[PDB]
């Protein structure tokens, strides 16, 4: 009786599970590790700081290796709750990573939004929003410090920590562009907010201090760190209409082994708007009532999972004239791809196509080398823009191939590609193996 009655229920079908046992679960031996310590250290920001300014920092040699980097900002609300959407993310327009005088990588505010939409999830995603927005129904004038972690490869895993110690003669710099305008902070739709305050910025770098045996090896040995890079181009979106399903062949100017492509359609007017506006709760400013307008989003609820408001009907990727895969619906890219490849939930209007089994991890799991592809093309088909966005009967009650008339406002297309490269470091200098 008890657990022993299971233990002795042993036969031939158990041999491949427990015969000639190799492991146990009840004796974990932890690996001894090199001694190290971690410290968060403030960097100096060069350049005038405020909206529309470009500033930069040079990472000092306080420690040996660097990993996580957080940009702090202090922003004040230019309107009430519901008027902002990830404004600290919007504020940091872009970040460029330069090592040894060469570009290693570059991120954009939209990428941060797209990245988050695809790869963060659950409470990590919520905590992230708490670090970039006002999520407790704050009012005009409220002041908060925001944190925007960077998403460069070395900011994601200690495994890729940049060996400042092995880069003795090369500097590591970050160039940050601040947006000229941030919704609900210094602008409201197209209007400026009189009296809006300028942001305060601070950049913090988490350094690793190694013990002497480890420090010696890094300083002396050559290293090759497998890193990730983001490639990005903006494109015109063929504009759909009430009378037609627009289609488009977009040339993809990408290179290197690519883990995945990602993209979204958006309305540049409103940061984070990847879907059409509508008079259904959360889908537009004042949605659900008489005062609703489908010219402006409910900014605090800009993101949505309501597929019906997404513009893309279907798509395929062609490589050198050969179809990569059969044309699939936008909903495939929006829900299936990330179900299988990430495990989180992707907002409507945001799409993913992986060439990898696990694009969300660091370990390579299949790549598409676009340097061997003369003509990579993303072929898109858009939905018919015939739904009266101001009428839920038409918005919520409709067909697969038809979207909002307001979906024609989503005229910008952002296509991203995340790839691998190698960061070679030797004798205090380094750079990427492949341009």
């Amino acid at each position: 009786a008890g657990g022993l009655s299971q233990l002795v229920a042993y036969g031939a079908q158990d041999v491949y599970l427990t015969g000639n046992p190799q492991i146990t679960f009840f004796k974990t031996v932890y690996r001894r590790y090199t001694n190290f310590a971690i410290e968060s250290i403030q960097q100096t920001i060069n350049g005038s700081v405020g909206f529309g300014n470009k500033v930069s920092t040079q990472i000092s040699r306080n420690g040996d290796l660097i990993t996580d980097i957080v940009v702090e900002f202090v922003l004040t609300k230019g309107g009430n709750g519901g008027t902002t959407y990830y404004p600290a993310e919007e504020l940091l327009q872009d970040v460029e990573l330069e090592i040894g005088g060469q570009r290693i990588d570059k991120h954009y505010n939209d990428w941060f939004r797209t990245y988050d939409a695809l790869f963060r999830m659950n409470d990590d995603r919520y905590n992230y929003r708490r670090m970039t927005d006002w999520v407790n129904n704050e009012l005009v004038g409220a002041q908060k410090r925001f944190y925007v972690p960077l998403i460069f490869f070395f900011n994601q895993t200690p495994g890729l920590a940049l060996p400042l110690i092995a880069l003795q003669y090369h500097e590591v710099k970050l160039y940050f562009t601040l947006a000229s305008q941030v919704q609900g902070v210094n602008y409201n739709g197209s209007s400026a907010i009189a009296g809006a305050a300028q942001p305060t910025m601070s950049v913090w770098v988490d350094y690793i201090f190694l013990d002497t045996q480890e420090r010696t090896r890094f300083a002396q040995l050559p290293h090759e760190y497998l890193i990730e890079q983001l490639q990005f181009t903006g494109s015109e979106t063929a504009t759909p209409s009430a009378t037609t399903q627009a289609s488009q062949n977009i040339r993809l100017n990408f290179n290197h082994p690519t883990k995945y492509l990602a993209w979204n359609f958006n309305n540049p007017t409103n940061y984070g708007q990847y879907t059409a506006l509508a008079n259904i709760p959360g889908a537009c400013s004042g949605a659900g009532t008489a005062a609703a307008t489908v010219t402006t989003p409910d900014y605090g609820n800009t993101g949505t999972y309501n597929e019906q408001l997404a513009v893309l009907d279907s798509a395929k990727i062609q490589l050198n004239g050969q179809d990569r895969f059969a044309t699939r619906k936008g909903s495939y890219f929006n829900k299936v791809q990330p179900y299988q490849s990430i495990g989180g939930v992707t907002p409507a209007g945001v799409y993913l196509y992986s060439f990898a089994l696990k694009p969300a991890g660091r370990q390579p799991s299949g790549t598409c080398n676009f340097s061997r592809i003369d003509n990579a093309t993303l072929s898109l088909t858009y939905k018919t823009c015939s739904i009266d966005a101001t009428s839920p009967a038409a918005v919520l009650g409709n067909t697969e191939t038809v979207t909002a008339n307001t979906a024609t406002l989503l005229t910008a297309l952002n296509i991203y590609a995340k790839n691998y490269n190698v960061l070679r470091i030797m004798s205090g200098m380094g750079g990427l193996a492949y341009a």
């Binding site: 090592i99 040894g100 005088g101 060469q102 003795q168 003669y169 090369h170 500097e171 290179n255 340097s371 061997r372 070679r424 030797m426 205090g428 200098m429 380094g430 750079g431 990427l432 193996a433 492949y434 341009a435």
Partner: protein, 58 residues
């Protein structure tokens, strides 16, 4: 004065060439099918594409 022993222009370890480099690899080793050749000779292919330094007396 100031001690900076590098140039800082990413011109040492960068393979900033076109995609004629893999074509040079094909004409450099043998075997125009490089979908199974780097899969076989890994170290022999890696050491064939590395740096060369021409020092200064200072």
């Amino acid at each position: 004065f100031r001690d900076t022993a590098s140039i800082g222009f990413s011109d040492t370890h960068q393979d900033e060439k076109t995609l004629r480099f893999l074509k040079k690899q094909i004409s450099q080793f043998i075997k125009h099918l490089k979908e199974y050749y780097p899969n076989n000779e890994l170290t022999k292919k890696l050491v064939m594409k590395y740096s060369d330094v021409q020092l200064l007396p200072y």
